[PDB]
Structure formats: C-alpha cells, structure tokens
Structure 1
Amino acid sequence: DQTNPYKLMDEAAQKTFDRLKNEQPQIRANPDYLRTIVDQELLPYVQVKYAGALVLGQYYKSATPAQREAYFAAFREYLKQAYGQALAMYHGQTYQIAPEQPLGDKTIVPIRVTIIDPNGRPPVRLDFQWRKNSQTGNWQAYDMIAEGVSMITTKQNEWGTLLRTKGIDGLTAQLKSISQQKITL
C-alpha cells in the first residue's frame, strides 16, 4: 500500500533484513555483494532522483542534460555503496519498527528502525526519511540516518565546496570515486 509509509517501511525492512540475514556466507565472501542486496531489496522504495536533487541544490537548474544524467547515475551508485556500508553491521539481529502514527496532511515522515543487540548492548537506530508525492498520495524513502549519519547531508559542506569550485562534474567524479570504495566488515 503505497499511500502509507509505515506499511512500506515494514515491507522494505522485511525484504532487506531477511536477505541480509540469510545470505551472510555470500556477504562474508564478498562484502561488495551488499550493493546488490541494497539495489534489489531497498532501492525500489527509494526516490533516488529526489535524494540526488537535494544534494545538488542550486546547481541542478544550470546543469546540462548530459551532466544531469551522469550525476544521477553516479549518485545511484553512491547510494548502493553507502546503504551497503551502513547495513553491513546487520547480520540477522531482531529489529523493531516505530508504530504507525497519524499522517494527517504531512508530506515528510521519519520512521525509526531499531536494531536490537542479542546480548543486551545498546541498540542501533536507523531513521528512515519518507516523503509524499502530493499529487499521487504515494510515499518513498529518500534518506536513512544511521545513528545521526545521513546518506545525503553528512558531507554537505565538503560537497558544497566541491560544487562551488568544480561544479556538478566535480561532484559526480567524487560520487563515482566514493562508490568504488570496497565495502568492509
């Protein structure tokens, strides 16, 4: 049900976390496989262009069609790497998802997923950020903030300077560069 981000979050967590739980041998043999799991289970619920547009800010409008295309393709690769690296710590832990609350007229909704430690250590909080398309009523995720670390605003200052000194092509090259870093465990 696309008009309720709590239902979508539940389903997306179920698919993503079950696959990370059940394919640990493959992940241990090649941690970059995490990109594939992220790509296939989680990114269908993520509005990749919306997230990319937030990072790009004022530089979007003046960018050329080719520059835009290259930027968005690099950004999507970066998201696979980032979500992959952030979820590498998940290997089958129990998790709890914040319960459904009134949506009212809201168009942005954060939803906390808590990863429970099996030994009673403190939990790890993943705050997924959901946005509504007000024309269609449908929701998609655009960020996941992992104990305060955002996939898109954490590097805002460095990416701001890079855009200002080298434009969108500078940032695209940097996103590509980051996406080629080996995921580690």
Structure 2
Amino acid sequence: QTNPYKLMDEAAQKTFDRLKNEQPQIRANPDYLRTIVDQELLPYVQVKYAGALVLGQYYKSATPAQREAYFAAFREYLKQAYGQALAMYHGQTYQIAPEQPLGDKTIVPIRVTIIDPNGRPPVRLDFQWRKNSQTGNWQAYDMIAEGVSMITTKQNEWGTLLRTKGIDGLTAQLKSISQQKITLE
C-alpha cells in the first residue's frame, strides 16, 4: 500500500501491536524500542527534509560532508528520541482521521489522536505527509504534537547551539543524545 492514510493506519497498528504484546522484551531491553521505531516508523519519515528545515540558514552554508554527518546523526537522534517516547506507553490507543481523497494535494495533514482510556487527556498529533519527489513514496516530514511542530520546537531548542557552534556543534549534540540509553518509568 502507498496511500498516506493507509500508511498511517498500518504504522499505527503495527507499532501499537508490538507495544501491547512485547512488553517483556521491552522491559528486558528498553533499547528494543529503537528497533520498533527503526522498522515501523522511520522508513515513513522524510528525515533529510525535516533535518534541513531544522538547520534553517545553516543548511545552505554547510558543506556536503557536514550535511552527510549531520543527517546521519539526526537519524540516530530520531531513533533514540522517539524510542524514548514509546517508552511512555501505558495502554494508550489511537484514532486516525478518516481517509479523504488525495486529489492533487501536495501536503496532506493526517491527524491521529492518542487516547489514554480512564487516564490522561487526549494527545493530538498531526502528521504532515508529502510525496518524496525522488523516491515516489509518501512520507511524513513533520509532526505537530499538542499544537507544537517538532521542527519548530527543535529550531527553538537548538537555536543558541546553532548560533554559537553551528552544524558541527549540533551534529555533536545529536550524536551525544542518540547514545543515551532509553529508560522506562
């Protein structure tokens, strides 16, 4: 399947299936959550498009080798960070927005609501899907989470680091963060 609603449905279903049913494996090795991210989610993420946007002005002035190193570190960072997000699983489930015709739409926002029955209030995610012009595949290049863009958030969080130490500095920080072990609550 190739339609971005169907990709959302599949990725959600598979991820929650493994979270629901493989807690022994996750408790035994929390880093297994990085594998779930790597297999079920990351292939559908437009990592370089997002990463370039996070860099902003610093992307244009970076060399190809700097860019390569940055994108590698950024990908590893995403595995760690969203692995750590999956570590917050405690029986939540999800509802995805219903499929709508694609038409000639170029960027398709697809909402998923993370529901915690009898627990915490809903968490609204809005994935920004577009067609990768090179690969021909639909991918998400950003996620709005609780009303905050992940790209924008990271621009803000890493702004001073970029202003003072540039893409080299950010690459080193991403690599550092990606090496932190995932922890369960």
Q: TM-score range by the shorter chain?
A: 0.7 to 0.9
Distance 1:144 1:184, change over 3 A: farther
Tell me if structure 1 keeps the 8 A contact 2:54–2:154. Answer: no
d(CA) in 1 for partners of 2:179, 2:111: 29
Give the deviation of 1:37 after TM superposition. Answer: 0.8
Q: Who is 2:170 aligned against?
A: 171
Task: Write the deviation string for residues 54-108 of structure 1: whole angstroms up to 9, x where unpaired.
Answer: 1122222321222111101100011111211222223443321110123333222
Task: Write the deviation string for residues 129-179 of structure 1: whole angstroms up to 9, x where unpaired.
Answer: 212245776410123333235443213123233222211101101111222
d(CA) in 1 for partners of 2:83, 2:159: 24
d(CA) in 1 for partners of 2:85, 2:150: 9
Tell me if structure 2 keeps the 8 A contact 1:81–1:183. Answer: yes
Which stretch has the larger CA shift, 93-102 or 127-136?
A: 127-136
Tell me if structure 2 keeps the 8 A contact 1:17–1:92. Answer: no
Task: Write the deviation string for residues 27-58 of structure 1: whole angstroms up to 9, x where unpaired.
Answer: 12232221111011111111111111111222
The alignment's C-alpha RMSD in Å is 2.2
Which stretch has the larger CA shift, 66-75 or 27-36?
A: 27-36
Identity %: 100
Distance 1:156 1:49, change over 3 A: same
Tell me if structure 2 keeps the 8 A contact 1:46–1:140. Answer: yes
d(CA) in 2 for partners of 1:28, 1:143: 29
Unaligned runs of at least 5 residues, structure 1: none
d(CA) in 1 for partners of 2:135, 2:7: 15
TM-score of the aligned structures, taking structure 2 as reference length? 0.86
Unaligned runs of at least 5 residues, structure 2: none
